[PDB]
Every structure is written in C-alpha cells, then in structure tokens.
Design an enzyme around this catalytic site. Structure first.
Site, PDB file in Angstrom:
ATOM      1  N   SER A 153     -11.386  10.461 -11.395  1.00 41.55           N
ATOM      2  CA  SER A 153     -10.257  10.524 -12.008  1.00 41.55           C
ATOM      3  C   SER A 153     -10.188  10.860 -13.526  1.00 41.55           C
ATOM      4  O   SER A 153     -10.988  12.033 -13.785  1.00 41.55           O
ATOM      5  CB  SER A 153      -9.445   9.162 -11.798  1.00 41.55           C
ATOM      6  N   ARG A 161       3.723   2.400 -14.753  1.00 40.84           N
ATOM      7  CA  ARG A 161       2.620   1.718 -13.999  1.00 40.84           C
ATOM      8  C   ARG A 161       2.739   1.782 -12.300  1.00 40.84           C
ATOM      9  O   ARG A 161       2.082   2.293 -11.658  1.00 40.84           O
ATOM     10  CB  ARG A 161       1.974   0.600 -14.327  1.00 40.84           C
ATOM     11  N   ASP A 220      -5.693  11.844  -0.946  1.00 41.29           N
ATOM     12  CA  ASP A 220      -5.282  11.985  -2.405  1.00 41.29           C
ATOM     13  C   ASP A 220      -4.046  12.553  -2.708  1.00 41.29           C
ATOM     14  O   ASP A 220      -4.246  14.140  -2.453  1.00 41.29           O
ATOM     15  CB  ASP A 220      -6.515  12.567  -3.414  1.00 41.29           C
ATOM     16  N   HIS A 247      -5.839   8.577  -3.880  1.00 40.19           N
ATOM     17  CA  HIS A 247      -6.699   8.396  -4.924  1.00 40.19           C
ATOM     18  C   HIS A 247      -7.581   7.271  -5.393  1.00 40.19           C
ATOM     19  O   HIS A 247      -8.479   7.405  -5.644  1.00 40.19           O
ATOM     20  CB  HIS A 247      -5.678   8.977  -6.063  1.00 40.19           C
ATOM     21  N   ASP A 248      -6.823   6.091  -5.010  1.00 40.18           N
ATOM     22  CA  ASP A 248      -7.544   4.771  -5.215  1.00 40.18           C
ATOM     23  C   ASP A 248      -8.919   4.765  -4.347  1.00 40.18           C
ATOM     24  O   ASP A 248      -9.683   3.807  -4.701  1.00 40.18           O
ATOM     25  CB  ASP A 248      -6.469   3.516  -5.032  1.00 40.18           C
TER      26      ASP A 248
HETATM   27 CL   LIG Z   1      -6.600   3.638 -13.372  1.00 36.19          CL
END
Ligand SMILES: [Cl-]
Ligand SMILES: [Cl-]
Ligand SMILES: [Cl-]
Ligand SMILES: [Mg+2]
Ligand SMILES: [Mg+2]
Ligand SMILES: [Mg+2]
Ligand SMILES: [Mg+2]
Ligand SMILES: [Mg+2]
Ligand SMILES: [Mg+2]
Lengths: 365, 366
Positions: B151, B221, B314, B344-345
């Site tokens: 990332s 967030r 992702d 993505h995680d």
């Molecule tokens: Cl992050």
C-alpha cells in the site's frame, strides 16, 4: 377517474393515505406524474418508467422552466423510439420521498410547513404502492410494462413481484435482488455525512435559511465514484492537475475539480432530506422480506422480464444481475451491457439500453 | 552518523535535523521514530526496512500494550525462522514523516513551541523516503539489504528502489501502483474534504484546543475502509442483516454499518486527523515518473531486483497496476498474484502468502 396531464406536462395526483411497511401512516400523499403518447381506449398500453435515486418524472425532453434537468433517458419515448409513442403511453412519476413534485421531506404538509423530520421512513415497496395508487387514481389498474435502472430497477423488481397479475413485462437494469453489505456501507456513511453536517438540524433545516450543503456535497462525491468505471476515470483524468492549478499550493487535481462540480450540480436541484430518505429506502431493499427469502420470492414470480447488467459496474456488480436472471423464471438469460462507464452506463449507453427496452416491450405485446 | 539502534522491540527517536523537501520548503528538527528486530551485522549490510501504510506505525510485530495501542500490523513477520529471519536479518521500521506515532508530523511541536498544525508543509512520498534514508544514515547505515512494503509502504518502497538503486539490493512492491490513479485521488481528496469540512478542523490548528475534527475523520476512515475490502466477502460476512437485535427502521443499525462505525472509533483513539490529511496528500502526489521522463522511463531505468505482488480482489489498487509494475521493472521476474477475498486488506491478512513474498525478496538480496 382523474385525467392524465397533457403530454409532457406535470400532473399532481392525490392518492390519500398510505399504510407504510414501517407501520407508519402518511396522509395526504401527492404523486407528480408526466406522460408521453396517447392512452389506448382499453388503457392497456402504459409503460411505466421508474427513475433512479436523484432522477425525476422528466424522462425525455430538454431542460426548461419547471425542469432543472433534461430528460434523464432523453429520447426513450417518442415516435419510433424504444418506447414508441405511436403504440405506447410512457408514464413516469416522481418517487414518493422525492423533491420535484411528489410528497417528501421538503414538501409542504397541510399546515403549510415542510414535512421535515415528520416525514416517515419509507421502503422501495412503499414507493411502488404509491405509484400503483397514483395510476389507479388515473383509471389505470394494469400496465403493459415497468422499466427502470438502479433504484428504478429496484422499484421495477418490487412491482413485478408484488403485482404480478397487473404487469405484463419488466426491465430490471443494473440492480440486485436485495441491498448488499457494500451498498449499505457506502449508503449509510453517505447519510452519516449529511447528518454530521452542523446545519442538518435534525432534518428540520428547511425553514432556517441554513442547509447541510457540505454534507450533501460529500455524499454525492463518494456516491459518484461508486457510479463510475475505475479505468475510464483514469483514462479521462489520470493524476493530472485542473487547468493551470497547482495542487501543491491549494490547487486541485482534475478528477477533484470534476467531483466538486458533481456536488455543486446536485445541490442546485436536489434536497438533502430527500437524499437521506431515498438512500434509506435503498438500504432496506430486499425482495425476499416476508416472502421466504430472495430465492423463494424470485422463483415464484412468473412475469416475463429482461435483466440487464453493466460489465464495469462497481456499485451493482454483474453477479447481482446474473442471480436475478438465474432465478426469475420469466427471464430468458442475462443481457450483458459492455461499457466502460460503470453503473452510469445505465444512463449513458443509450443504444444498448434502448434495445433492452424494445426487447421488454416485445414480451408485453 | 554513529548513533546506535534501540534495544530490540523498543522505540528509538532519531534526530535527522533539517530536511529540504521536494517542494523546496524546509522542515527543521525532524525526528524519526524507529523500532527494530534482530542483530545488526558487523558490516551493517543485513538491514531489511519494513515500510508501513497510511495509518501504520513502526510496530510491525509483537503484542499491544503500554506505548502500543495496536499489535504488530504484520505480526510474526520478523523473528527466529520468520519471513524476515532475525537470526540473519535486522528488521528496521520507521514511523513515516508526517505521522503521529513518534516521528515529526502536524501534531508535533515546532520550534515556536506550538504544534505544527496548519504550518506543516505538504510532503511527497519521495520526502518520506528522504527522511527514512537520513534516519538510517544517522545510525551509520548507508545501504540496506531490502525494502518491503504494501500500500503506501509499497509506494515508499518503489521510490526507494528507483531513487536509491545503488543503496538497496532488493525490494518487495505489494498492492501499489506506479502513480496515483484518478479513482484513488477522487476518494482521497474527498476524504480530506470531509475532515476539513468538520467545524472543529479549525484550519488544521485544532491541536491543543480541546476540540478535534472527530466526525470528519470517522467519515473519511469509513469510506476508506470500504475501498480496502472485498465486495463479496463484505456481503458474505454481513449481508443486509441488522446489527444484533437493532432495527434500522427504528433508529437501529445494519451489521455492516455498526462494523464501519467501529473502524472509525478505533482509528480515532490512536490516530491524528492532521496526519491523515498530510499523508493522504502524499498519496495524491505519488508518481514515480515525475522529473524522470514518465512512468515507463523511470521504471525501465531501475535495475533493482524486485518482487511485485497484487491481490485478486483489491478494489483500491487493482491488479492491473501491479501488472504494469511487473512488466516494466527489469528486475521483476513476473507478477506474483495473491488470491484473497479480503480486498486490499489482503496485504495485511494473508500472512502466509505475504510471508512467502518477503522470503522471495530476501532471496534476491543475498
Ligand atoms: Cl492503513
Ligand atoms: Cl404514523
Ligand atoms: Cl509513461
Ligand atoms: Mg426498502
Ligand atoms: Mg432478508
Ligand atoms: Mg430463470
Ligand atoms: Mg507524493
Ligand atoms: Mg506525471
Ligand atoms: Mg519486467
């Protein structure tokens, strides 16, 4: 028994009181309606066109006095058009909860004040009930077809499932059987952005001269990203700056200026309270509720339908339309619209969507 | 440079002094926090730099506890026999310039005794690498065996191998692209706008006022977390179910909604809104091609051996971006695809797959 408005003009249809899915009862409901083409003597040629989240009853024609936006499916209804008005009568409502003629949070209640926080939470099914009641007030108890994309496709789905004996065919475009976690995720956070705006005022900003403009802009910017294709966005803007602006010194990126412009456009024509109410209806979308689940509800619906989905759709991914096409016995197979424009393809792919409409009306004639 | 690394696991604060940023702006009295695992070799040639992502810190492995609100974000990556085998390598992790976990950032006090706040200059990914390189030099470390990151950490790793090719022997570039994309800039600039629209942002000088832009940071967030996840997995886990026994019609919450609210609350308790803005602006400016003839020219001219990895699901850094890196970097033998439902995680969650990518990378460094 009420008469349809003159072609193109807005009519305001009183439908009285409605019992809502939440248990709430809303009185003195008014549904705005527009229509194109003549109604047949048998009143059996109505094609109901169902608009999406921020759409209105103006499906075709230019903008002008009384119409902040042009037809959102411009050209869909007319002589020789996909809804050929030499044969069909295209009818479109402003959805219950909207802000362009139909009863919603910004509309004046009988006391002359905006509904505001008095407006109850509604469901997609409530929206369909209100449209069905509006058509009934106009002496129309059966429709040839219902067609719609996005939230319009959810209205169309609940129409064919809830009233299978009163509609001959449907187009379900760029929609799913129920709201998904990802959709609910972005949608509830969009609502949160509006409600966190200090001028939201518990939903009763309407009379105060302040409005949650910052929150509504943010909600629309995040929403617009979900409507687009990832590759096309980068093809159009990449990481380029806006004009001669310098992002390292207060300037904007090109995609940033574009998103700001999308927010400004919505603010000029749409109400934050409506955005919240209609997004809540999206959150509660679920064709399976009270019907034994999604599979049972779809398998028991015998209405002929065309199901369409867009390859690059990031908000209503293609797997959702494949499921609809697999489970509805009246669907011959998924129609795949290849488009780079994401969810917004259901508005931009005029030729492909026109053909899906023609195919739908072929199942109703 | 003759300072010494802190005791293993413990935080050390490295004074790198004044830095001239890419923009020409200067920042004085820069401190870079560091943690490390494993012994340094006599030649100081066994350093593996682990580069954290947007809201990460230098605590890559180990439990939570006093001084550590979060456990290791790559827990288990460094240790005896681990992917970074500390019987051979010295794993070093900084807190990035602009962060809020020890290094100089917006909430740090400037020379005038007030928090940097609105005076903190915009930094780039290259500025972040300049600071990390300077911190290592202060410790007498002028060449590293490898840099690894996913990332934003992959963006730092990319600028490290392209910018300092003679001073690094291999790199892992995970779940990142050669430049910021339109979609990334779109969500990133809107996340920043959400923070700056908070009434308590106070032009970025909310520090020490008793008010902070908590609502805007939570919202940013929540939207970012969605971009980090996989679409199908989110629906498998939560679907449209209600949270516990709550009723969304009567003020209740959906399960995925309560989940997102909790992600917001967690970040609030450990992270600074000013850092979120500054570091997101560094993501917006990410572009390995700037000043180098563009992306293709920059990548083709970098000879560092690298492993490039991407995650199937992702949605923020789609696999096409890692296909591009693998195709253009001559030191890449071919794209490594991490199969994951977690989006993505996956670069945090797929410990086995990511551990194998790190081992592959370190194989290129000896
Ligand atoms: Cl992050
Ligand atoms: Cl009531
Ligand atoms: Cl190029
Ligand atoms: Mg609903
Ligand atoms: Mg259900
Ligand atoms: Mg079927
Ligand atoms: Mg940058
Ligand atoms: Mg460039
Ligand atoms: Mg290559």
């Amino acid at each position: 028994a009420m008469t349809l408005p003159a072609e193109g003009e807005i009519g305001l249809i009183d439908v009285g009181s409605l019992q809502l899915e939440s248990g709430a009862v809303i009185d003195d409901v008014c549904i705005a309606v527009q229509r194109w083409g003549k109604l047949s003597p048998a009143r059996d040629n109505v094609v109901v066109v169902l608009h999406a989240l921020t759409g209105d009853s103006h499906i075709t024609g230019p903008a002008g006095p009384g119409h902040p936006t042009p037809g959102w499916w411009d050209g869909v209804a007319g002589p020789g058009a996909p809804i050929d008005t030499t044969r069909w009568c295209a009818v479109a409502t402003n959805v219950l909860g909207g802000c362009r003629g139909s009863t919603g949070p910004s509309s004046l209640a009988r006391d002359g004040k905006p509904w505001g926080s008095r407006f109850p939470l509604i469901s997609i099914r409530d929206q369909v009930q209100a449209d069905v009641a509006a058509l009934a007030a106009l002496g129309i108890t059966e429709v040839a077809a219902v067609v719609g994309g996005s939230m319009g496709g959810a209205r169309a789905l609940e129409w064919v499932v809830g009233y299978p004996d009163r509609v001959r065919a449907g187009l379900l475009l760029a929609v799913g059987a129920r709201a998904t976690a990802d959709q609910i995720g972005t949608q509830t956070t969009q609502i949160a952005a509006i409600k966190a705006d200090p001028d939201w005022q518990s939903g009763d900003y309407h009379e105060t001269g302040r409005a949650p403009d910052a929150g509504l802009r943010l909600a629309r910017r995040f929403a617009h990203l979900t409507y687009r294709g990832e590759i096309e966005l980068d093809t159009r803007f990449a990481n380029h700056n806006q004009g001669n602006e310098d992002p390292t010194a207060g300037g904007r990126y090109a995609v940033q200026s574009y998103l700001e412009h999308q927010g400004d456009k919505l603010l000029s024509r749409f109400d934050a309270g409506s955005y919240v109410i209609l997004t809540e209806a999206l959150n509660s979308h679920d064709v399976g509720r009270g019907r034994g689940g999604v599979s049972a509800a779809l398998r028991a619906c015998p209405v002929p339908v065309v199901v369409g989905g867009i390859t690059s759709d990031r908000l209503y991914p293609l797997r959702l339309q494949q499921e609809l096409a697999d489970l509805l016995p009246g669907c011959a197979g998924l129609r795949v619209v290849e488009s780079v424009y994401g969810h917004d393809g259901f508005l931009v792919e005029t030729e492909a969507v026109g053909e899906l409409i023609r195919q739908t009306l072929g199942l109703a004639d």
